[PDB]
Amino acid sequence: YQQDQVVKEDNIEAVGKKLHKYNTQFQEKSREYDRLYEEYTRTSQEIQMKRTAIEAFNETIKIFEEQCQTQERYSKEYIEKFKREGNEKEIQRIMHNYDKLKSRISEIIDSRRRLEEDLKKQAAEYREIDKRMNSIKPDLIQLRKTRDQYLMWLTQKGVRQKKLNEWLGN
Amino acid sequence: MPPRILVECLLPNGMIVTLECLREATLITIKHELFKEARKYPLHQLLQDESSYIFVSVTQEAEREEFFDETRRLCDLRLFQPFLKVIEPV
């Protein structure tokens, strides 16, 4: 590697130009790959948040549903007693409160549906980020290694470091 | 969680009541406000003393939690949604 070699200078300059071209090319793909990787990561986290939140909706809905079973079974008793004493005001109030509970359940079920549909769209963006990334990777890797094949060859012919920096410089 | 927030409480007589809370309030003072507020609602005679009851809710991690430690503050509970179901743990 280190010390200066006994080979034609013409061959070294041509290989050095190629190192340069292949480093530029590799760098371009890598920059491209990384921008996507950043959006890939943020998308993956948001997706994981949405799955958890769907689960919490599922469980929230169970609880409000159980509340519904509680009210039909507690107000079974008292409604039958009440229209015997003619209190249609208090029956009205119980029914109003019940309408409120069912209304809120349906708002929650609606919110879950929305999030399911947004998870569906975002999971698709995610798949498309992945396909773009997969299309680049093999290219990124192959350019890098050709760049390495040339770098190491030049390093081995004792080429000065300031000359290798000029070629890697862009 | 802004300074004061609406918390939906699900009473064991079937009733829903909406209650304004200081985000900082402990569950024990909220249980207290709640059972005062319940008397303004139907079927308030079916309620035992407030101390027989415990709150249940869902955390942001989607787990169902029973809050036996009522000194805990409403803002530290990590509620998915501002509601509390009231149960006799039996």
CSV table of C-alpha atoms in Angstrom, one decimal:
chain,number,residue,atom,x,y,z
A,1,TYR,CA,0.0,0.0,0.0
A,2,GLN,CA,2.1,2.9,1.4
A,3,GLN,CA,5.2,3.5,-0.7
A,4,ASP,CA,5.2,4.8,-4.3
A,5,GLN,CA,4.9,2.1,-7.0
A,6,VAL,CA,6.7,1.3,-10.3
A,7,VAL,CA,3.8,1.7,-12.8
A,8,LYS,CA,2.7,4.1,-15.6
A,9,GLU,CA,1.2,7.5,-14.4
A,10,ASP,CA,-1.3,7.4,-17.3
A,11,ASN,CA,-3.1,4.3,-16.0
A,12,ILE,CA,-3.3,6.0,-12.5
A,13,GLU,CA,-5.0,9.2,-13.7
A,14,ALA,CA,-7.6,7.3,-15.7
A,15,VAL,CA,-8.5,5.1,-12.7
A,16,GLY,CA,-8.6,8.2,-10.5
A,17,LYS,CA,-11.1,9.9,-12.8
A,18,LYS,CA,-13.2,6.7,-12.5
A,19,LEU,CA,-12.9,6.7,-8.7
A,20,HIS,CA,-14.2,10.2,-8.8
A,21,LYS,CA,-17.2,9.4,-11.1
A,22,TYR,CA,-18.2,6.4,-9.0
A,23,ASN,CA,-17.9,8.2,-5.7
A,24,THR,CA,-20.1,11.0,-7.0
A,25,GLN,CA,-22.6,8.5,-8.2
A,26,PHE,CA,-22.6,6.5,-5.0
A,27,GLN,CA,-22.9,9.7,-2.9
A,28,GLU,CA,-26.0,10.8,-4.9
A,29,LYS,CA,-27.8,7.5,-4.3
A,30,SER,CA,-26.9,7.5,-0.6
A,31,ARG,CA,-28.3,11.0,-0.1
A,32,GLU,CA,-31.4,9.8,-1.9
A,33,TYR,CA,-31.7,6.7,0.2
A,34,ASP,CA,-31.3,8.6,3.4
A,35,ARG,CA,-34.1,11.2,2.7
A,36,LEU,CA,-36.4,8.2,2.2
A,37,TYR,CA,-35.1,6.4,5.2
A,38,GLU,CA,-36.0,9.5,7.3
A,39,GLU,CA,-39.6,9.5,6.1
A,40,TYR,CA,-39.7,5.7,6.4
A,41,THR,CA,-38.8,5.9,10.1
A,42,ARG,CA,-41.3,8.7,11.0
A,43,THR,CA,-44.0,6.8,9.1
A,44,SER,CA,-43.2,3.6,10.9
A,45,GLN,CA,-43.6,5.3,14.3
A,46,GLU,CA,-46.8,7.1,13.4
A,47,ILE,CA,-48.2,3.7,12.2
A,48,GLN,CA,-47.3,2.1,15.5
A,49,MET,CA,-49.0,4.8,17.4
A,50,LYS,CA,-52.2,4.4,15.3
A,51,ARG,CA,-52.3,0.6,15.9
A,52,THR,CA,-52.1,1.1,19.6
A,53,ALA,CA,-54.7,3.9,19.5
A,54,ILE,CA,-57.1,1.5,17.6
A,55,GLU,CA,-56.6,-1.0,20.3
A,56,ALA,CA,-57.4,1.6,22.9
A,57,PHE,CA,-60.6,2.5,21.0
A,58,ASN,CA,-61.5,-1.2,20.9
A,59,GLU,CA,-61.1,-1.3,24.6
A,60,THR,CA,-62.9,2.0,25.3
A,61,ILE,CA,-65.8,0.8,23.2
A,62,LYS,CA,-66.1,-2.4,25.2
A,63,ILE,CA,-66.4,-0.3,28.4
A,64,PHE,CA,-69.1,2.0,27.0
A,65,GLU,CA,-70.9,-1.1,25.6
A,66,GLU,CA,-70.8,-2.6,29.2
A,67,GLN,CA,-72.2,0.7,30.5
A,68,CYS,CA,-75.1,0.2,28.1
A,69,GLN,CA,-75.8,-3.3,29.6
A,70,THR,CA,-75.7,-1.8,33.1
A,71,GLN,CA,-78.3,0.9,32.2
A,72,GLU,CA,-80.9,-1.4,30.5
A,73,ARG,CA,-80.7,-3.8,33.6
A,74,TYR,CA,-80.9,-1.0,36.2
A,75,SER,CA,-83.7,1.0,34.5
A,76,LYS,CA,-85.7,-2.2,33.6
A,77,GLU,CA,-86.7,-2.2,37.2
A,78,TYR,CA,-87.4,1.4,37.8
A,79,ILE,CA,-89.2,2.2,34.5
A,80,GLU,CA,-91.9,-0.4,35.2
A,81,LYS,CA,-92.4,1.1,38.7
A,82,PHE,CA,-92.5,4.7,37.4
A,83,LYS,CA,-95.3,4.6,34.7
A,84,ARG,CA,-97.5,3.1,37.5
A,85,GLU,CA,-96.9,6.3,39.5
A,86,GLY,CA,-97.2,8.4,36.3
A,87,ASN,CA,-93.8,10.0,36.4
A,88,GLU,CA,-93.1,10.4,32.6
A,89,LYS,CA,-90.7,13.3,33.5
A,90,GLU,CA,-88.2,10.9,35.2
A,91,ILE,CA,-88.6,8.2,32.5
A,92,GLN,CA,-87.9,11.0,30.0
A,93,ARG,CA,-84.7,12.0,31.9
A,94,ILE,CA,-83.5,8.4,32.0
A,95,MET,CA,-84.1,8.1,28.3
A,96,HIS,CA,-82.4,11.4,27.6
A,97,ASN,CA,-79.3,10.3,29.5
A,98,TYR,CA,-79.4,7.0,27.7
A,99,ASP,CA,-79.6,8.8,24.3
A,100,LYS,CA,-76.5,10.8,25.3
A,101,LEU,CA,-74.6,7.6,26.1
A,102,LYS,CA,-75.5,5.9,22.8
A,103,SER,CA,-74.7,9.1,20.9
A,104,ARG,CA,-71.2,9.2,22.5
A,105,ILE,CA,-70.6,5.5,21.7
A,106,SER,CA,-71.4,6.1,18.1
A,107,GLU,CA,-69.0,9.2,18.0
A,108,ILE,CA,-66.3,6.9,19.4
A,109,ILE,CA,-67.0,4.1,16.9
A,110,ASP,CA,-66.9,6.7,14.1
A,111,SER,CA,-63.5,8.0,15.4
A,112,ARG,CA,-62.1,4.4,15.3
A,113,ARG,CA,-63.3,3.9,11.7
A,114,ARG,CA,-61.6,7.1,10.7
A,115,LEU,CA,-58.3,6.0,12.3
A,116,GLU,CA,-58.6,2.6,10.6
A,117,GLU,CA,-59.0,4.2,7.2
A,118,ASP,CA,-56.0,6.6,7.9
A,119,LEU,CA,-53.9,3.6,9.0
A,120,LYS,CA,-54.9,1.9,5.7
A,121,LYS,CA,-53.7,4.9,3.6
A,122,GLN,CA,-50.6,5.5,5.6
A,123,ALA,CA,-49.6,1.8,5.6
A,124,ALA,CA,-49.7,2.1,1.8
A,125,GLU,CA,-47.5,5.2,1.7
A,126,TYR,CA,-45.1,3.1,3.9
A,127,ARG,CA,-45.1,0.2,1.4
A,128,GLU,CA,-44.4,2.7,-1.4
A,129,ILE,CA,-41.5,4.2,0.6
A,130,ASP,CA,-40.1,0.7,1.0
A,131,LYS,CA,-40.3,-0.2,-2.7
A,132,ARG,CA,-38.5,3.0,-3.7
A,133,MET,CA,-35.8,2.2,-1.1
A,134,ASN,CA,-35.5,-1.4,-2.3
A,135,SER,CA,-35.0,-0.1,-5.9
A,136,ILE,CA,-32.1,2.1,-4.8
A,137,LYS,CA,-30.3,-0.1,-2.3
A,138,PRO,CA,-28.7,-2.7,-4.8
A,139,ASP,CA,-27.5,0.3,-6.8
A,140,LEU,CA,-26.2,2.2,-3.9
A,141,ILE,CA,-24.3,-0.9,-2.7
A,142,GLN,CA,-22.9,-1.8,-6.1
A,143,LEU,CA,-21.6,1.7,-6.8
A,144,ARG,CA,-20.0,1.9,-3.4
A,145,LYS,CA,-18.1,-1.3,-3.9
A,146,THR,CA,-16.9,-0.3,-7.3
A,147,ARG,CA,-15.8,2.9,-5.7
A,148,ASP,CA,-14.0,0.7,-3.1
A,149,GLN,CA,-12.4,-1.5,-5.8
A,150,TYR,CA,-10.9,1.6,-7.3
A,151,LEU,CA,-9.9,3.3,-4.1
A,152,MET,CA,-8.0,0.3,-2.8
A,153,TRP,CA,-6.2,-0.2,-6.1
A,154,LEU,CA,-5.0,3.4,-6.0
A,155,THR,CA,-4.0,3.2,-2.3
A,156,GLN,CA,-2.0,0.1,-3.1
A,157,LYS,CA,0.0,1.8,-5.9
A,158,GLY,CA,1.3,4.2,-3.3
A,159,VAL,CA,-0.8,7.2,-4.5
A,160,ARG,CA,-0.5,10.3,-2.3
A,161,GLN,CA,-3.4,11.0,0.1
A,162,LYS,CA,-3.9,14.6,-1.1
A,163,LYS,CA,-4.4,13.2,-4.6
A,164,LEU,CA,-7.0,10.7,-3.3
A,165,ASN,CA,-8.8,13.5,-1.5
A,166,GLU,CA,-9.0,15.5,-4.7
A,167,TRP,CA,-10.9,12.6,-6.3
A,168,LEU,CA,-13.2,11.8,-3.4
A,169,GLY,CA,-13.9,15.6,-2.9
A,170,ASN,CA,-17.2,15.8,-4.7
B,1,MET,CA,-54.8,18.6,29.2
B,2,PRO,CA,-55.8,22.3,29.6
B,3,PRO,CA,-56.3,23.7,33.2
B,4,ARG,CA,-60.0,22.5,33.4
B,5,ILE,CA,-61.3,19.6,31.3
B,6,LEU,CA,-64.6,17.7,30.7
B,7,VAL,CA,-64.5,14.2,32.0
B,8,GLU,CA,-67.2,11.7,31.1
B,9,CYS,CA,-68.1,9.5,34.1
B,10,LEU,CA,-70.0,6.3,33.7
B,11,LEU,CA,-71.9,5.6,36.9
B,12,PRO,CA,-72.9,2.1,38.1
B,13,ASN,CA,-76.6,3.0,37.9
B,14,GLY,CA,-76.2,3.3,34.1
B,15,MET,CA,-76.0,7.1,34.1
B,16,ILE,CA,-73.5,9.2,32.1
B,17,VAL,CA,-72.5,12.6,33.7
B,18,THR,CA,-70.1,15.1,32.3
B,19,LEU,CA,-67.9,16.7,34.9
B,20,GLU,CA,-65.4,19.6,34.7
B,21,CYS,CA,-62.1,18.8,36.5
B,22,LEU,CA,-58.9,20.5,37.3
B,23,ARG,CA,-56.4,18.4,35.3
B,24,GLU,CA,-54.3,18.4,38.6
B,25,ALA,CA,-57.1,17.0,40.8
B,26,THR,CA,-56.6,13.7,42.6
B,27,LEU,CA,-59.0,10.8,41.8
B,28,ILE,CA,-60.3,11.0,45.4
B,29,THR,CA,-61.5,14.6,45.1
B,30,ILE,CA,-62.9,13.9,41.6
B,31,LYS,CA,-64.9,10.9,43.1
B,32,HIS,CA,-66.2,13.3,45.6
B,33,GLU,CA,-67.3,16.0,43.1
B,34,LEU,CA,-68.8,13.2,41.0
B,35,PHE,CA,-71.0,11.7,43.7
B,36,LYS,CA,-72.3,15.3,44.6
B,37,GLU,CA,-73.1,15.8,40.9
B,38,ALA,CA,-74.9,12.4,40.7
B,39,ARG,CA,-77.7,13.6,43.0
B,40,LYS,CA,-78.8,15.9,40.2
B,41,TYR,CA,-79.3,12.8,38.0
B,42,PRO,CA,-81.8,10.0,37.9
B,43,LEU,CA,-81.4,6.8,40.0
B,44,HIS,CA,-79.2,8.5,42.5
B,45,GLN,CA,-80.8,6.4,45.3
B,46,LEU,CA,-79.2,3.3,43.9
B,47,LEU,CA,-75.7,4.6,44.8
B,48,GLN,CA,-73.8,3.3,47.8
B,49,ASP,CA,-71.3,5.6,49.5
B,50,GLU,CA,-68.7,7.0,47.2
B,51,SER,CA,-65.9,5.0,49.0
B,52,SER,CA,-67.3,1.6,47.8
B,53,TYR,CA,-66.4,2.5,44.3
B,54,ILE,CA,-63.2,2.6,42.2
B,55,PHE,CA,-62.5,4.2,38.8
B,56,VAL,CA,-61.6,2.2,35.7
B,57,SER,CA,-60.3,3.6,32.4
B,58,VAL,CA,-58.1,3.0,29.4
B,59,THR,CA,-54.5,4.2,29.1
B,60,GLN,CA,-52.7,5.5,26.0
B,61,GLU,CA,-51.1,2.0,25.8
B,62,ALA,CA,-54.6,0.4,25.4
B,63,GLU,CA,-54.7,-1.3,28.8
B,64,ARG,CA,-57.7,-1.3,31.1
B,65,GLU,CA,-56.6,0.1,34.5
B,66,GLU,CA,-58.3,0.0,37.9
B,67,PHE,CA,-57.2,2.9,40.0
B,68,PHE,CA,-57.0,1.9,43.7
B,69,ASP,CA,-54.5,4.7,44.4
B,70,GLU,CA,-56.8,7.7,44.4
B,71,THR,CA,-54.1,10.2,45.4
B,72,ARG,CA,-52.9,9.9,41.8
B,73,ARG,CA,-53.6,13.0,39.7
B,74,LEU,CA,-55.8,13.0,36.6
B,75,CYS,CA,-53.0,14.3,34.4
B,76,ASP,CA,-50.6,11.4,35.4
B,77,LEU,CA,-53.1,8.6,34.6
B,78,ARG,CA,-52.2,8.6,30.9
B,79,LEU,CA,-55.8,8.4,29.8
B,80,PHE,CA,-56.5,7.6,26.1
B,81,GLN,CA,-59.7,9.6,26.5
B,82,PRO,CA,-61.1,11.7,29.4
B,83,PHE,CA,-63.6,9.2,30.8
B,84,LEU,CA,-63.8,7.2,34.0
B,85,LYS,CA,-66.1,4.2,34.6
B,86,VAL,CA,-67.2,3.7,38.2
B,87,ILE,CA,-67.4,0.1,39.5
B,88,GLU,CA,-67.8,-1.7,42.7
B,89,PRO,CA,-64.7,-3.9,42.4
B,90,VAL,CA,-66.6,-6.6,44.4
